[PDB]
Each structure stands twice: as structure tokens, then as C-alpha cells.
Design a protein around this ligand. Sequence first.
Ligand SMILES: C[C@H](CC(=O)O)S(=O)(=O)c1ccc(Cl)cc1
Ligand SMILES: C[C@H](CC(=O)O)S(=O)(=O)c1ccc(Cl)cc1
Lengths: 300, 237
Amino acid sequence: MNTVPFTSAPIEVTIGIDQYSFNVKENQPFHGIKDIPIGHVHVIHFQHADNSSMRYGYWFDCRMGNFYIQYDPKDGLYKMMEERDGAKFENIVHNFKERQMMVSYPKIDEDDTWYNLTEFVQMDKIRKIVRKDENQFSYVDSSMTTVQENELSDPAHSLNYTVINFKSREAIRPGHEMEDFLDKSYYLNTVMLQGIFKNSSNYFGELQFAFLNAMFFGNYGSSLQWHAMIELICSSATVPKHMLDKLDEILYYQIKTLPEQYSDILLNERVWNICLYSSFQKNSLHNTEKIMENKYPELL
Amino acid sequence: GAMNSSNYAELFNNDIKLFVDDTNVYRVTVHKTFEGNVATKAINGCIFTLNPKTGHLFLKIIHTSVWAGQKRLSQLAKWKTAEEVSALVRSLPKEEQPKQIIVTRKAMLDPLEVHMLDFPNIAIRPTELRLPFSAAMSIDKLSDVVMKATEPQMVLFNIYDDWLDRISSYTAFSRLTLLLRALKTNEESAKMILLSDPTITIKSYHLWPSFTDEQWITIESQMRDLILTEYGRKYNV
Ligand SMILES: C[C@H](CC(=O)O)S(=O)(=O)c1ccc(Cl)cc1
Ligand SMILES: C[C@H](CC(=O)O)S(=O)(=O)c1ccc(Cl)cc1
């Protein structure tokens, strides 16, 4: 297991760790999170009690360094840092653990939820979407725009998702206009999978990351990207059978985890009806269709 | 965007523009079969591509062979229209290329946009105007050229004859849409109005009779009266 200690908690804040969350009171003796399962990425996220503006947070992997949190009263936020003195870090943590000033990451042993949401998500691929090379961890917040959003504006602080545009020359081969516009298989299989992503695992990782950014930070740019990558698959007549099966699992766990009270803003009615009921893969998403129909029949 | 009376000169700004009507591209007759089923048979059609300012009409004839062995013909017809318009633009010298293409039906927007991706500065737009260009086939010399064609073929016309010598394009387009609306509403009566007087003839290089200014006023009155008559017959007014 691994640990993210906090120097202190000087402002009241709701802290999230993956899909879990808890409240810390102003100057309460909180010194971080322990028993974090090694082997997956994680995200620690914040929403200040006195200013719900700016959800923000940090994607990290405890195998790539020792990270702690410290409040910066100038920039007004909880910042992730890396401690390079390992023995110092171990000494600090043991003291906080001995004094039981840390919350335990609350993993139920029947529960595969976080594995199922992050199966294909890899810290090295996150750091190419979120460009801040001098850190081993990656900051994301509510307001960061995507490269595509900044085409339709500080490029250093953007989300470099792969741009998907069904009416672009990249999606449409000259001489195959009707064919490629009504059937996206060329764009999916040659341009995106063979060309840009190299394999389906990297495509699903970007997809999963887009969903998690949208749900944990209320990032509109991420929500757009998630839906675009789903629609690109569903709108293709020719998709490997292994991809369709795995996509049904991916979406099933995302719908299952979405807070019901946020469904109105996190699910695009148009895109989901097309994918489930009109598209080439209308019949290929049995588990996702069933949970969507039992949980969010209003959207349909 | 899409257009209105809130600019009655924005569709008419100063840019080369074309109106593209696809109604008459895919045309069929429906008939019973020997076994009592129903079958279609296609007939020749045409794309109506018109410049409002000059009156130049690029009539692309759609020969039935285009459809042989093809499926989902109503959908293909929109994509074939888009392809032929795109090929027309590419055939024109750059200074003759349009700055705006205006489709009479919204279903043509995506097919024409996708075909024209290589021309990002040409705006593709719809219109709220209800233009009667489907009645182009009621014009005898255009119907004749479409139905005699044995192969794909493009034919150029000036749909305003020599009118621009005497009137503005605003007035010529007005006259044209009133003539086509009347032919769409009561074809026989409209044609009776246009031909009745045999001392007024259609020049061999024209589509419409050689009316004087005063006769056109009279003819325009009779077209407004026919449209009103038919509105009355329709609604019992
Ligand atoms: C779409 C509206 C926001 C916007 O247009 O930026 S919203 O508030 O419903 C929304 C906000 C965040 C997300 Cl993750 C999805 C939707
Ligand atoms: C019948 C009228 C003209 C006429 O009666 O002389 S109209 O309905 O065609 C018309 C409609 C829109 C415009 Cl931009 C111009 C004329």
C-alpha cells in the first residue's frame, strides 16, 4: 500500500480520492490518506467549502514517486508536491500513522469499481494529454479547455485530447464522401486506431480518462470528448468483436457509477439515443442498454 | 446562416451565389405488377442550379442509368446532387466560383458540406423562402431536353431570356418565382395564360413568350389571379 500525507488542512474542503469522498473541517487535524492500492492510477480532488468555484485535482501513481499535499495560501489551493528525500518521507508518514491522523482508502474486497473505470488508463498517457513535464503527477480542473475547444485560450493549460471531427478532411476520403460520412469505419480503424492510437487499449484509456475528468471536475471539454469517442465507434459498421464487447463493459461501469443527480448534465440525450437505438451497433451494447433503460429511462 | 425578410438584400448582398434544388433528381412512376405488387420505374431527372443575379441555369440531366443496381435511391440522390454541384464548382474558373451555395431543402446541407470540404470559404446555407423550383419541369423546353436525353448531359440556359435588358434582377427573380408558383399550382391554366394569344411567340432561343412591358404587367396580374383563384378553390373561400 501507499500514502499521500498532507502538511495540514487550513481551509474547509471536500476531498475526493477516486470515487470516494469526505469532508475536512477548517484546521481539523487531518494529515492525509493511507492504504491506497498500488497498481492503479488514482486522482485526489478538491472542492473548497467556501467557494465551490474550481473543482481541481491531481492524477498520480504511487509507484512513480512519493507525493504529498500542502496548502499554498498565496494561490489559494491544495498543491501536490514530490518529496525526493525518501527517508524523510517515510519518517513523516510513520508519525502521522502512529498518531492516526490519516483516513484509510476505503476499499471493499468485493469491489472492482476502480479497476473497472481505469483498466486502460496509464499515467504515461495522461502526461501527454496534460502537459507539465517537470512533475510526475498531472493537475486538471473544472475550467481547463481542450485543444479542440481552443480552435473554435492559454495553450499551456489545455487538455490535449485527440481531436475528432466527423466533417473534416481527416475523417473523409476524397471520392468516398457518402461512404465515409454514413459509415465511420475508415476514420475509426485506419485514421484513429492504426494511425493515431496504435491500438484499442490506448483509445479506451483516453475514453476512460475523458469520462473521469468530466465526472470528477465537471469539465465540459472532457464530456464532449467522451461522447465523441463513443459515437465514433457506434457509427462504424466494421469494428472488431473484441472492441465492441469491451466497450459494453466500459460504459456499463461508467453509467453504473454516475451520480443520478448529475445525469441531466453528464449524459447527452442525442448521442445516447443514436448509439443505442439508431446506430450500426444498436444491438451490440446489451449490458449498457439494460442499465441505461433501468436507471435513466427518462433520457430515452 | 439560414435567410429571411429581416435582410431582403443579404441573400442579395454582391457575392456570386447559386440556388440548388434537388427535387427533380430522382423521379419515378409507381405501377402495379402482374402479381399485384407495386413497383417503381425511374425516369430522367435534373439538378436545377441557378444564379438569381444573372439568370444562368446549370441544368444537369440525370439519366436513369445512374440508378442501375443501386440501393436507397432517395438517399443516394442527395449525395449524387452534392457530387455534381461540387464538380461544377471545380470546373468553373476561380473568379466565377460561388461565395455562397443555397439549398432549397435542408437535407442537402450535410451532403453538400461534406463534398465541399476542400472549399472552406464557400458558405453552404438553407433558406426559409419557399421557392417553386420543382416546377422547372413545367417549362416545356426544359422538360423536353431532360426526357430526350440518352446519357448524362449538362445544358446551360438563361431562365430570364432577355429580361435583364429592361428590368432589374430583383424584378426578374420576382417574375420567375410568380410564374413557377402559378405553374406549380395550376399547370394547365398557367400555360393557357402564357400562350392563349398566338400573336405573341416564344423566340427559338428563349423559354418564355416575347411580352412587351405592358403585356408582362397583364400576364403577371393573371398569374396573381390564378393563384388566388386556386387558394379559393382549395379552402372553400
Ligand atoms: C453543459 C453545461 C455547461 C457548459 O455548457 O459548459 S452544463 O452545466 O450543463 C455542463 C457542465 C459540465 C459538464 Cl461536465 C457537462 C455539462
Ligand atoms: C408573388 C410576389 C411577387 C409579386 O406578387 O409580384 S412573391 O410572393 O413572389 C415575392 C416573395 C418574396 C420576394 Cl423576395 C419577392 C416576391
